[PDB]
Design a binder for this molecule. Structure first.
Ligand code: CDL
Ligand code: ZMP
Ligand code: SF4
Ligand code: SF4
Ligand code: SF4
Ligand code: SF4
Ligand code: FES
Ligand code: K
Ligand code: ZN
Lengths: 113, 360, 126, 208, 95, 48, 176, 96, 263, 114
């Protein structure tokens, strides 16, 4: 319908939101495949990204996709997809599915002292 | 003419407030909060009161909650008069300063009628409010509110459509939405940039879910939309004050737990338990169960938060005070890039900066 | 590697901003404070406390107020164990003395002992 | 317990406990504890090597989106060997929620600066340098922010006295504002206010 | 009942007066030592002893909730009156 | 009094020209008001 | 539950375009501003004639401190030190002893009026209404130590202002 | 209020607003400075029976925080709450 | 060993036979409220503040006096325990005088503190209170017997430790008065220690009277030098002036007493 | 005893940073005496710099001297940029303070301090 403005300053209108979300979701899944399968981050992120990709594939209309993606404007859904992609590319390098690097001391989180 | 870098040096009013709080009890550390945002006194009282009442696992009575919302919106009128009139006085519009400080003077008379001080009331306390509204106060609040929209109208007649006020504020200090969220902005600084966020709607406190009001949202992120947001928040504060005057319930004003709030002075001079409780609350103070809260309210400058840590004693172990002006004056350097030197006074004006809460 | 090895004694006296007079002339006292014998509650005997030696308090010539020049005259620190307080004193270069925790030894209480047949532990009245 | 007692929010307690399990199992490399207060505030106590990987997670993850850093805090607790307790308060505007990320350091171990995640932290942790003395590595402009320019010591440390060690006055001999060791005409009177009777039996610690 | 030292200085209701050789009288040189000439110890002595026919009397200082906490005084001693601890009004059993 | 003046103007004091030995013809002082008139003039009550 | 400030797309018909251009060339909003300033020129100003006219206060007003007396001349302070335990500024210094008739009375009752934050916790903590924070606010001094009140100055403020203080407490005490 | 009708009409013309209906100076419409004495109500715990403090003890119902994880299947990914509902535009005055 | 297993709120503790309920709860770090129990006096059992629920038992027991039986689960925080504490604190504050500001025990009173902790926050007492005639038992112990809660630590101290046998209860009922019954001057060498163990301001220190107040006093832990016993003391001061001398507990010297010369 | 460093791996890199900070202070002292128009000589200020560096000379921990170098760079940054005034620079010279008693006998005469 060519929404005139997103309402948020600095967040421009996306002309083709559906194909953009599909490309970002498949790129998230392609990056996320390099994480081991036992990691909970991969399981949870694949689950929510498959839900979002099926909702994007299931709706031609932009505003109905905004009401059932449940994330506000469609452009901030795209922005969140970009943030999730950058996050997953950092999670590959950090490897945080590893065991705890160091136990805290014996009364480290004891409150009150 | 341009500004390449702005380095604000602060601490010129650092008094070490939140170290002094550590050596005083909760009632004794309450009047430190009147002096942080010293144009928003009862709102900071309300934020500290809600922090302590969250840690105490008690709640105010309904009439105290309506008094806190009524005086929080009177406080919001005070603060946005201060904001708009000093932001206009620094640019050069010096006349609505004098026009609106008579209205601000009458609201300080409201504070003095209800507490005895004009600014630092120590009126909103953990447990409720200190004292009940004297007779004829709400009638005069109604007589103020009946006239105050015309004062806002003639303010808005002097500034809003003026081309000189627009030229000093329309292209000035544009904040994007993502950089407003990333710099920790809050209140009008978010809402001028399009971000639909208000703590009285989303994470509501005392009876703000029972008042009906609107949230002004800007569209360009500049000084002018933040000006229009503050003026419309004065409008909506008049709306909430009308709803508070019409829906004020009868009843008590302190919590009826006399191990938290002190008893009435007639029964302290009659009952043994009331005299013991009066003694122990005004000398030791109530003990607070151990824990760390971060209770944030929507002060008229933004999210005012208290990270209060209680060790189980009658004094705070730690009390970190989050001010909106701290993050706003941190973001001053990005908000002033590419602007002129006379734009910087407009940008320091449009961030409603009060250095008591900036410095503590 | 990303970890260095420091086998020196932990000392931070150059970083705390404390002047020399209030490091090397003060005697920290690490102690469990005694129960006030005005009261029977024992919640103030639960933690260790670090205080310092008292310095001179004199009379204000104008009002008679207690004038001091000791910045550490109100500094009382709370510690859960003795060894935490000893480590905090040694870390700051405070020479300290430690008093051991004096718990009350357990008593032998018998209400019937108040009414014995042949022992001196009878109560003469009740 | 209706009129004077705060009502318990069990729905938010269950939701925050579930999301705390979620964060603890996505990031087991750094998460040390997860707890939820009785007034329903979630605390994620992490290891200080994972300041950046946890905070970048909560800021960027689609089930978290903690896009706002509300507050950043240190707490001096001298009875711990890691006496400083760095407290992050985060706000998700998307899910209308708040989380608390807690970690620890002593005087000498640096914490990684979180300006790469929240630029809002640029002053806050700088204040943590000024008030507590915690150093933040890879900070843009780390210096004092609130104390005077020649100020020795970190004031919100609990071994630092209430009044300082120095005080200022104008001296007309040298025509200058000067610093001298602090003498108070009236000493701050210390009040031992704590009752010797136990106030809260739920918070009782077991004896030795 | 204010009195006067040999230095000419007025003695307060505490009993405070500086010594002659104390330098701190120089603060009143050219000025005045503000004392209050209504000594409460003399003004409560002016009040008469209330003869009551009860054994235990209650005092709140008058005014209800504008006086002091209400206390109960025993009047079984006949040598001594029953003095209120707050207001100093002393009572006597009339029998 | 003048109750047709607005609230703040409606009560005032013309100070005496001599109080406690001091000529106050030009040196009027706000603390010249005795405490019984200080309630009425500051409008703590309606009653003189 | 929200509204959009400044989201008006202006009209582009020749009527509104010529209206905005006449506003630009003939300065309509500037004459509106001159009209509002001219409107306040002919209003009666809000200026009270101080010192002859006084700003309105309430009986709760928290000004200068005063130690009170019972209606017999006996002072109300029974030396209990609640006002200095509650004092957020530690402005109150109290020392006591039994006087010559055995009454629990103070010998030192100091208030530093330059530490005091004038918040009135002392008068609301006082069990016997001894310390009050009266209605005097015009007590500026020329020297710092004249704002360091002892018991004599505070009892003189009580004797000076009792005729007003008792009436203010009489007007307010059913809210306390 | 004491303005003559020529200056009053000039002032209302210059402001563009009927100023006399809403005067910013206060007159006899305001409350009396002397009020009757109140009778303030008591709270809900001012009862002589069924008023044991252990049934209304708020501070002693505060518990220590529930430790959810401590270092001594196909479950759904969760969020800290349901997502925020989109705000409705004002029916009163949307500026639209 | 012959230690028996009891439970305090579920938590097990192994106790010697003859251990009371109060000592068994002490061994896990809970202090049962008390007014007449003193660990160096004999067990009186007559203030009833230590009433506590043993589960599977429909009656509160006097924890200072009741020995534990094997397998008891002591419910120190249950509903009827707290109802018993509030009822007993209500009866203690029935006839107790509103003297807390003019009292030397304010801020260091057991009755204030465990009224804040274990009692109700208001009065149902709508009657007039009793007033008890004061006594003159010497120049050291100021006597205000209206404040007396009749706990008989007077009598147990003067009998068992002081060895005097001259304080006792006359009268009967609500008219029961602790005193000497005659104009008698209680001047033992340990006569000031009844100022310590009196939980209320009925027995106060006549030299210390009205001069100070406990929260503003700094506590300096020091040694007696008035004899060669070496009694541990607290010199409590206020603004650079010595206010009074209290005892410290030392189990091997002075158990928690000091002499009148020291005091 | 395996701790995370600040900048230096051992004491040699630490002494290198101490030495470069000393070079920066030594170069800066004449500029500081000029633009704050201090009434001390350049040699007097350089002796004060040598005194402030010899005061911390007893430290063998690399993290502690790294923090001393960091705080010295902060003081230097407050000096070069005119953020200190003349008063903050002259607070290193305790000039209004009377000289303290050093031996036993004068400390006995003045008071109770050890
Ligand atoms: C234009 C030139 C001035 C003409 C006079 C004038 O406009 O008087 C104001 C007069 C009153 O105006 P207002 O503000 O509505 O009166 C309300 C007052 O409260 C009503 O007045 P009031 O109740 O306050 O009565 C007391 C007042 C009465 O007011 C006057 O006497 C007015 C001043 C007269 C000169 O007298 C004074 O206060 C004494 C003031 C003495 C000095 C006045 C200035 C003198 C300047 C020349 C030397 O204006 C009119 O009646 C309208 C303008 C008429 C113009 C006619 C053509 C010329
Ligand atoms: C005008 C006033 C200007 C005031 C300027 C104040 C600046 C204060 C900067 C202080 C920075 C320091 O103290 S870092 C020194 C700490 N270093 C150590 O503890 C290691 C020991 N250092 C040494 O022995 C030094 O002499 C050397 C040069 C590093 C090595 O010598 P050794 O070999 O023999
Ligand atoms: S003024 Fe009141 S609170 Fe203060 S010591 Fe005197 S009686 Fe107590
Ligand atoms: S008004 Fe407040 S600060 Fe002033 S003396 Fe009273 S309690 Fe202290
Ligand atoms: S003995 Fe205790 S409860 Fe009784 S008056 Fe004294 S302080 Fe109050
Ligand atoms: S005077 Fe004190 S110790 Fe003696 S019986 Fe009474 S309350 Fe107990
Ligand atoms: S303590 Fe057991 S009854 Fe007094
Ligand atoms: K006693
Ligand atoms: Zn009386």
């Amino acid at each position: 319908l060519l929404k005139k403005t997103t309402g948020l300053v600095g967040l421009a209108v996306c002309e083709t939101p559906h194909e953009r979300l599909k490309i970002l979701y498949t790129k998230i899944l392609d990056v996320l495949g390099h994480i081991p399968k036992n990691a909970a981050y991969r399981k949870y992120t694949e689950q929510i990204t498959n839900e979002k990709l099926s909702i994007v594939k299931a709706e031609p209309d932009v505003k109905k996709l905004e009401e059932q993606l449940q994330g506000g404007q469609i452009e901030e859904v795209i922005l969140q997809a970009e943030n999730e992609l950058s996050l997953a590319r950092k999670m590959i390098q950090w490897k945080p599915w590893e065991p705890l690097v160091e136990e805290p001391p014996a009364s480290q989180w004891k409150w009150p002292i | 003419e341009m500004v390449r870098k702005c380095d604000p040096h602060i601490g010129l009013l650092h008094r070490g407030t939140e170290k002094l709080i550590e050596y005083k009890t909760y009632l004794q550390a309450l009047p430190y909060f009147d002096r942080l945002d010293y144009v928003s006194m009862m709102c900071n009282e309300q934020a500290y009161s809600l922090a302590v009442e969250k840690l105490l696992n008690i709640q105010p009575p309904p009439r105290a909650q309506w008094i806190r919302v009524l005086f929080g919106e009177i406080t919001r009128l005070l603060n946005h008069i201060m904001a708009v009139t000093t932001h206009a006085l620094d640019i050069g519009a010096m006349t609505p300063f004098f026009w609106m400080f008579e209205e601000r003077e009458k609201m300080f008379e409201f504070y003095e009628r209800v507490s005895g001080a004009r600014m630092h009331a120590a009126y909103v306390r953990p447990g409720g409010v200190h004292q009940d509204l004297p007779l004829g106060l709400m009638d005069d609040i109604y007589e103020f509110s009946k006239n105050f929209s015309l004062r806002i109208d003639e303010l808005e007649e002097m500034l809003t459509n003026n081309r000189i006020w627009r030229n000093r504020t329309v292209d000035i200090g544009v904040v994007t939405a993502e950089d407003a969220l990333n710099y920790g902005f809050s209140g009008v600084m978010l809402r001028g940039s399009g971000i639909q966020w208000d703590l009285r709607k989303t994470q509501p406190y005392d009876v703000y879910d029972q008042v009906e009001f609107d949230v002004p949202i800007g569209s360009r992120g500049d000084c002018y939309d933040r000006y229009l947001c503050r003026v419309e928040e004065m409008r909506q504060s008049i709306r909430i004050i009308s709803q508070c005057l019409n829906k004020m319930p009868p009843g008590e004003i302190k919590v009826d737990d006399a191990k938290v709030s002190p008893p009435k002075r007639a029964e302290m001079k009659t009952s043994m338990e009331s005299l013991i409780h009066h003694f122990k609350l005004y000398t030791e103070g109530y003990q607070v169960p151990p824990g760390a809260t971060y209770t944030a309210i929507e002060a008229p400058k933004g999210e005012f938060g208290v990270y209060l840590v209680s060790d189980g004693s009658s004094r705070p172990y730690r009390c970190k005070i989050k001010a909106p002006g701290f993050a706003h004056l941190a973001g001053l350097d990005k908000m002033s890039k590419g602007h002129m030197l006379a734009d910087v006074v407009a940008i320091i004006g449009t961030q409603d900066i009060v250095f008591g809460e900036v410095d503590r | 590697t990303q970890l260095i090895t420091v086998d020196e004694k932990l000392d931070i006296t150059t970083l705390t901003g404390v002047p020399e007079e209030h490091i090397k002339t003060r005697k920290a006292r690490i102690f469990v404070p005694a129960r006030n014998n005005m009261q029977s509650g024992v919640n103030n005997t639960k933690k260790w406390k670090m205080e310092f030696d008292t310095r001179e308090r004199w009379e204000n010539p104008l009002m008679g107020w207690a004038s001091t020049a000791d910045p550490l005259s109100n500094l009382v620190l709370t510690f859960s164990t003795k060894e935490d307080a000893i480590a905090f004193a040694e870390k700051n270069g405070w020479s300290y003395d430690v008093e051991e925790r004096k718990v009350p030894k357990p008593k032998s209480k018998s209400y019937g002992a108040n009414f014995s047949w042949n022992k001196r532990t009878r109560v003469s009245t009740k | 317990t209706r009129p004077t007692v705060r009502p318990r929010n069990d729905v938010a307690h269950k939701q925050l406990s579930a999301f705390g399990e979620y964060v603890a199992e996505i990031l087991p490399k750094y998460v040390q504890q997860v707890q939820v207060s009785c007034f329903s505030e979630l605390e994620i106590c992490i290891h200080p090597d994972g300041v950046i990987p946890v905070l970048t997670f909560l800021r960027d993850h689609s089930n978290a989106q903690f896009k706002s850093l509300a507050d950043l805090t240190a707490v001096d607790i001298p009875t711990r060997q890691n006496r400083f307790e760095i407290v992050y308060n985060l706000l998700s505007l998307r899910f209308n929620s708040r989380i608390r990320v807690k970690t620890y350091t002593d005087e000498l171990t640096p914490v990684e600066s979180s300006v790469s995640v929240y630029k809002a932290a640029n002053w806050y942790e700088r204040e943590i340098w000024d008030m507590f003395g915690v150093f933040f590595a890879n900070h843009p402009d780390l210096r004092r922010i609130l104390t005077d320019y020649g100020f020795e010591g970190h004031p919100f440390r609990k071994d630092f006295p209430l009044s300082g060690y120095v005080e200022l006055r104008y001296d007309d001999e040298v025509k200058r504002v000067v610093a001298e060791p602090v003498e108070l005409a009236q000493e701050f009177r210390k009040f031992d206010l704590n009752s010797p009777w136990e106030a809260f039996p739920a918070y009782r610690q077991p004896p030795e | 009942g204010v009195r006067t030292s040999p230095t000419g200085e007025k003695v307060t209701h505490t009993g405070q007066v500086y010594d002659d050789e104390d330098y701190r009288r120089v603060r009143f040189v050219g000025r005045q030592k503000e004392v209050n000439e209504n000594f409460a110890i003399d003004l409560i002595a002016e009040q008469p002893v209330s003869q009551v026919g009860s054994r235990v009397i209650s005092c709140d200082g008058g005014g209800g909730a504008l006086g002091h906490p209400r206390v109960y005084i025993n009047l079984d001693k006949e040598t001594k009156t029953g003095t209120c601890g707050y207001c100093g009004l002393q009572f006597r059993q009339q029998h | 009094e003048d109750n047709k003046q607005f609230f703040g103007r409606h009560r005032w004091v013309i100070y005496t020209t001599e109080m406690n030995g001091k000529n106050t013809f030009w040196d009027v002082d706000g603390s010249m008001v005795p405490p019984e008139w200080h309630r009425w003039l500051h409008c703590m009550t309606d009653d003189p | 539950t929200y509204k959009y400030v400044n989201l008006r797309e202006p009209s582009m018909d020749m009527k509104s375009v010529t209206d905005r251009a006449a506003q630009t060339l003939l300065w309509t909003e500037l004459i509106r501003g001159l009209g509002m300033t001219l409107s306040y020129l002919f209003r009666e100003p809000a200026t009270i004639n101080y010192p002859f006219e006084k700003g309105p206060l309430s009986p709760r007003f928290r000004g200068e401190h005063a130690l009170r007396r019972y209606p017999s001349g006996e002072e109300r302070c029974i030396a209990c030190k609640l006002c200095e335990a509650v004092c957020p500024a530690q402005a109150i210094t109290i020392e006591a002893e039994p006087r010559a008739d055995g009454s629990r009375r103070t010998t030192r009752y100091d208030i530093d009026m330059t530490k005091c934050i004038y918040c009135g916790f002392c008068q609301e903590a006082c069990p016997v209404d001894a310390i009050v924070e009266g209605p005097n606010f015009e007590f500026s001094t020329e020297t710092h130590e004249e704002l360091l009140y002892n018991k004599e100055k505070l009892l003189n403020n009580g004797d000076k202002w009792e005729a007003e203080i008792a009436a203010n407490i009489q007007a307010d005490y059913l809210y306390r | 209020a004491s303005a003559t009708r020529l200056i009053q009409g000039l002032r209302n013309w210059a402001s563009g607003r009927d100023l006399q209906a809403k005067l910013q100076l206060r007159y006899q419409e305001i409350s009396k400075r002397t009020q009757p004495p109140p009778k303030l109500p008591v709270g809900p715990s001012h009862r002589l029976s069924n008023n044991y403090y252990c049934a209304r003890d708020g501070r002693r119902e505060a518990m220590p925080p529930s430790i959810v994880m401590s270092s001594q299947s196909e479950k759904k990914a969760v969020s800290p709450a349901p997502p925020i509902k989109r705000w409705e535009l004002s029916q009163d005055e949307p500026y639209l | 060993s012959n230690l028996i297993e009891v439970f305090v709120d579920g938590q097990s503790v192994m106790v010697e036979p003859g251990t009371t309920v109060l000592q068994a709860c002490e061994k896990v770090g809970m202090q049962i409220p008390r007014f007449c129990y003193h660990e160096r006096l004999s067990v009186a059992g007559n203030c009833r503040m230590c009433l506590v629920e043993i589960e599977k038992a429909p009656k509160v027991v006097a924890a200072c006096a009741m020995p534990v039986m094997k397998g008891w689960n002591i419910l120190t925080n249950s509903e009827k325990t707290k109802k018993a504490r509030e009822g007993v604190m209500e009866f203690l504050l029935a006839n107790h005088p509103l003297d807390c500001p003019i009292c030397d025990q304010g801020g260091e009173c057991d009755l204030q503190d465990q009224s804040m902790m274990f009692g109700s926050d208001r009065s149902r007492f709508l009657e007039g209170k009793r007033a008890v005639e004061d006594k003159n038992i010497g120049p050291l112990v100021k006597t205000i017997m209206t404040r007396c809660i009749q706990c008989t630590r007077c009598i147990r101290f003067a009998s068992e430790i002081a060895g005097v046998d001259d304080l006792g209860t006359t009268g009967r009922g609500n008219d029961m008065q602790v005193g000497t019954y005659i104009e008698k001057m209680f001047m033992s060498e340990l006569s000031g220690n009844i100022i310590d163990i009196c939980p209320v301001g009925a027995l106060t220190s006549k030299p210390y009277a009205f001069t100070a107040r406990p929260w503003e006093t700094r506590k300096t832990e020091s040694i007696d030098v008035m004899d060669a016993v070496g009694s541990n003391i607290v010199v409590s001061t206020r603004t650079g002036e010595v206010m009074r001398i209290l005892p410290r507990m030392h189990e091997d010297i002075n158990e928690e007493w000091i002499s009148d010369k020291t005091r | 005893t395996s701790v995370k460093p600040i900048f230096s791996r051992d004491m040699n890199e630490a002494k290198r940073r101490v030495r470069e900070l000393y070079r920066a202070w030594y170069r800066e002292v004449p500029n500081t005496v000029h633009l704050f128009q201090l009434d001390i000589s350049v040699k007097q200020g350089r002796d004060k710099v040598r005194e402030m560096f010899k005061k911390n000379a007893h430290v063998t921990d690399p993290r502690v001297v790294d923090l001393l170098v960091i705080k010295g760079k902060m003081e230097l940054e407050e000096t070069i940029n005119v953020w200190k005034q003349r008063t903050h620079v002259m607070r290193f010279f305790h000039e209004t303070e009377a000289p303290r008693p050093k031996d036993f006998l004068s400390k006995f005469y003045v008071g109770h301090d050890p």
